[PDB]
Design a protein around this ligand. Sequence first.
Ligand SMILES: Nc1ncnc2c1ncn2[C@@H]1O[C@H](COP(=O)(O)OP(=O)(O)NP(=O)(O)O)[C@@H](O)[C@H]1O
Ligand SMILES: Nc1ncnc2c1ncn2[C@@H]1O[C@H](COP(=O)(O)OP(=O)(O)NP(=O)(O)O)[C@@H](O)[C@H]1O
Ligand SMILES: N[C@@H](Cc1ccccc1Cl)C(=O)O
Ligand SMILES: N[C@@H](Cc1ccccc1Cl)C(=O)O
Lengths: 267, 267
Amino acid sequence: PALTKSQTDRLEVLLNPKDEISLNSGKPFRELESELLSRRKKDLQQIYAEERENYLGKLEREITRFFVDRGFLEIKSPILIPLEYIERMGIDNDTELSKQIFRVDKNFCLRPMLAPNLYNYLRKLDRALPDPIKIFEIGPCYRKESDGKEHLEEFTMLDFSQMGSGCTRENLESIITDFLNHLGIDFKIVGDSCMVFGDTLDVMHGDLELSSAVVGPIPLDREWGIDKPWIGAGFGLERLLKVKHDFKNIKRAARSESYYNGISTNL
Amino acid sequence: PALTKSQTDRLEVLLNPKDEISLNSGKPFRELESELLSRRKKDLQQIYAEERENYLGKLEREITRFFVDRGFLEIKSPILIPLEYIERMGIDNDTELSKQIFRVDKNFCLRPMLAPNLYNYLRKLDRALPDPIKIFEIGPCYRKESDGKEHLEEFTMLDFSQMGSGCTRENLESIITDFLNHLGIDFKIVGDSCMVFGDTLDVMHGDLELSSAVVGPIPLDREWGIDKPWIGAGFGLERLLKVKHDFKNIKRAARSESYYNGISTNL
Ligand SMILES: Nc1ncnc2c1ncn2[C@@H]1O[C@H](COP(=O)(O)OP(=O)(O)NP(=O)(O)O)[C@@H](O)[C@H]1O
Ligand SMILES: Nc1ncnc2c1ncn2[C@@H]1O[C@H](COP(=O)(O)OP(=O)(O)NP(=O)(O)O)[C@@H](O)[C@H]1O
Ligand SMILES: N[C@@H](Cc1ccccc1Cl)C(=O)O
Ligand SMILES: N[C@@H](Cc1ccccc1Cl)C(=O)O
């Protein structure tokens, strides 16, 4: 007959992009599932025998090397941050980002973004390091958005910043260009046409936003004690993974108990 | 005169054990503070100019290389986990670690250990991978215990497990020995003298517990679908860093806005 929805869902979970098998012919739901199962089992086994690195962790280690080798300091800051940091980010309790905050206790939350801890480091480091100040962080970030397709509730941000001299948009577009060229991902920076400083740039791969990027100074810097030019960009690693491996669903790239390196773990 | 308490706190924040400056003599507080501010500013400059890797990230990457080399698959599983996983770990709403949990919504919590997600990986991978199953994860864990001196509220665990053949106490002690020999840390393993399976092991550095390790099976295995022998050990990376760098206070090893690579950021 014709594959029911559960049979369709079940095969979509077992399918990978490299799979060539004819997913429409005379075979029952159930040759097809068994075939994919055998393919996905051999995929885990090959992983276990020859590689054994997690994709999310591996990409994290590769991005780290890129920025360290470019003069950027590697920051590991708290994931649990004061709720007051969200307030000085300008996310008041009527904005749309305001409703996506995982609160913990009364006073704390899971950081939805890396910027506020990075604002603080930039302020403290400016007392001890020579111009310009270049820092970056990679790590977990949380938001109650999960439209499922392009959006996770638990994801991994990269965020880098330069502060002081050299902080132009053509320098910022030159860092993003080397980064994505090193990753092997094509892009496409949209924004205002003749924007010098102050406004955001988007890094696109198709209809997929890989990053929002900022050419400071911006009025928010005063709330953080930052008084200096700066440029910076935030990238979601799961979207990057989605691009390199052609994942259909971004959940294939996330921290998970259901997928490992894009392979279903329910075999 | 003799130092006040705000003054003594200031010098302890700026001190490092490599320092030989005599914290007791005829010098004024400001003279000692300025020497230390000098030493610490140059420590970060040297870090920014030539090193640039964070101690916590860098230690995480080297532990991964070690365990991948030995045949352990690298896992990246969720940090926000269901509250029900906690109770299935033997913490009822009456136990001691139950009060220390960071609840997020009404269902989920910040994981205080890696065991539940690793249980699920062990059960799922048995299906697909040959005997024995060897896995490990490194990442954030959250406990409301933080007496400060040796506990952190936000910390980083390594947790490794083998399941199937080779799950003997002898081979659990051999892994741990190779690992701490690799990281250059003296240790001693305390346990039941005649314990074969079922009980825990404490790996100690003097008074500081580095790890609790387990020679399964244990009764808890029923709740996670595990019916094979296994061995496992959980380790704290900030504790490892505290011993390796002789940190007086474990705060200096953590995710923090206050200390970079053991060095205060308030200079
Ligand atoms: N929920 C999410 N899941 C995955 N990646 C995300 C998520 N939110 C943000 N990112 C990534 O983080 C980058 C910088 O964050 P940000 O600019 O705050 O996102 P954004 O502007 O809200 N765009 P979008 O996440 O599509 O709505 C984005 O360009 C994405 O690559
Ligand atoms: N709050 C914490 N801060 C830092 N490290 C921790 C913390 N809790 C646990 N660890 C580390 O994680 C390892 C495995 O966790 P676990 O065995 O559950 O801790 P434990 O048995 O309660 N030992 P302890 O919490 O010191 O009494 C321990 O050996 C510690 O090295
Ligand atoms: N909002 C920033 C993050 C950030 C915060 C403070 C200072 C610099 C940066 Cl890149 C971004 O879009 O990358
Ligand atoms: N309870 C373990 C962690 C764990 C749980 C389930 C399966 C394997 C392991 Cl190592 C420990 O504390 O070592």
